[PDB]
Design a protein around this ligand. Sequence first.
Ligand SMILES: N[C@@H](CCC(=O)N[C@@H](CS)C(=O)NCC(=O)O)C(=O)O
Ligand SMILES: N[C@@H](CCC(=O)N[C@@H](CS)C(=O)NCC(=O)O)C(=O)O
Ligand SMILES: O=[N+]([O-])c1ccc(-c2cc[nH]n2)cc1
Lengths: 198, 198
Amino acid sequence: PNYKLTYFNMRGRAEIIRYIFAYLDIQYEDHRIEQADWPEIKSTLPFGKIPILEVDGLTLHQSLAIARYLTKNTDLAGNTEMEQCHVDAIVDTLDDFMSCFPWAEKKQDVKEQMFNELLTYNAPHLMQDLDTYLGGREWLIGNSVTWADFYWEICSTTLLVFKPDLLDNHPRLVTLRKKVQAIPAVANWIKRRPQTKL
Amino acid sequence: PNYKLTYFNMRGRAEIIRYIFAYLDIQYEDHRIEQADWPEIKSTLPFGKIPILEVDGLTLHQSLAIARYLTKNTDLAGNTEMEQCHVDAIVDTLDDFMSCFPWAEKKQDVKEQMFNELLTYNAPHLMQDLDTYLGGREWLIGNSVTWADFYWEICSTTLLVFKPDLLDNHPRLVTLRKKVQAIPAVANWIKRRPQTKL
Ligand SMILES: N[C@@H](CCC(=O)N[C@@H](CS)C(=O)NCC(=O)O)C(=O)O
Ligand SMILES: N[C@@H](CCC(=O)N[C@@H](CS)C(=O)NCC(=O)O)C(=O)O
Ligand SMILES: O=[N+]([O-])c1ccc(-c2cc[nH]n2)cc1
């Protein structure tokens, strides 16, 4: 199929889709827009938000809805309906936390203060929950990589930009990040992707 | 399997799971806890949030992850891979909006203000988006009911508690709620369920 991904020049909410395409060896057009192109694109969209994915001309929206759709019938989704449930739940837990951050806050001091509170209290709590959920296992769910591990690596990459020592007491979570990054298709993608802060 | 759902005594985030059990005619224990006993149960949970669904000796978490699991390979899932994506995307759009509400805000004045703002300034646009998206179809996705229709009915019910006039300019959206409420299994549940505000 002919896939076209639209988002800003940023990892952000589209990166999970980008990892999935890379891993599954699926070709797509990685369309990145500048704000000036947005108002016009936005007006054409039923829900006015990005990312969107156009599949043979038909437009899909909601990044995680799209990610799940792409992993359909692949090992990345989870090996059973039960494992798929754990995969979806871990993804949701991570998304719930990332949504706490005031990404669009215009008062720089308020943004800094909120980021700091979230990274001092909430983040370490979640890291301990994640660390114990993973235990000494290889991947978050089951015995092979799933898009939940991808989402962990992606979310943590963003959190580390703001609190570099966040995983300093969580070597098992660091090890999970390294295992995802070392998957050849992922390693390749990380090397060639546009470099952006977020 | 033996199902035990744990949540507060309210529709809230567990209601979608309750409609799914009803529709699929699956018996389950509808466990509802009092606030005072929550801190104790929270301490034993891998991620400290509810609802949770215990299936056999397994605990599951994240309401939508559970809803997705229970509807997989049932007539409540989309009819094609792409329809499944649209089902997930409409649910996520509704969820994104409902999760913006500060349900756990202890400062009453701050809470009411945020509620009023979201209901007055944001809710009408979501209604516009959903109305346009539905167009003239019978259901949100495809030619038959999906759990996205259930979620729409559930979310709108709560929104109408706070803003009764929300659907005055959207008869097609009122018609959809009525269609969902007309489904025998759903009608039966709406009639017999504990009648709570939220
Ligand atoms: N949960 C949705 C969120 C969509 C969303 O909030 N997108 C943002 C960009 S990260 C957006 O388009 N907001 C700016 C705007 O629409 O004007 C998803 O993952 O796709
Ligand atoms: N995204 C999660 C949200 C779960 C959630 O935030 N539940 C609330 C109750 S509505 C909760 O457990 N909060 C009480 C607490 O965290 O102490 C889901 O859909 O299940
Ligand atoms: O009254 N509540 O406490 C409450 C909490 C959450 C929701 C919710 C979140 C996403 N969908 N529905 C609805 C009601």
